[PDB]
Amino acid sequence: NLKPFERDISTEIYNCYFPLQSYGFQPTV
Amino acid sequence: INLVRDLPQGFSALEPLVDLPIGINITRFQTLLALHRSYLTPGDSSSGW
Lengths: 29, 49
Prior knowledge:
The structure is cut from a larger assembly and holds two copies of chain A.
Chain A: no helix or strand
PDB class: viral protein
Keywords: SARS-CoV-2, spike, fully glycosylated, viral protein
Entry title: Cryo-EM structure of SARS-CoV-2 Spike ectodomain
């Protein structure tokens, strides 16, 4: 997909699925 | 070398000075300027280029 040392702001199409993902205060994990 | 016709002849030692870790890819470069003068030093410049 992408190589290191790299950034990206507005996640263009890679249509797609539900994007985000959280490491919440639900640590049981 | 006093010759001012073109690029030179000779064998020039070249050594590094500085590195700065930016961390992203580049594929374009240039340089740009501005050339606004008046007083300067040479008589009456008034250089309409």
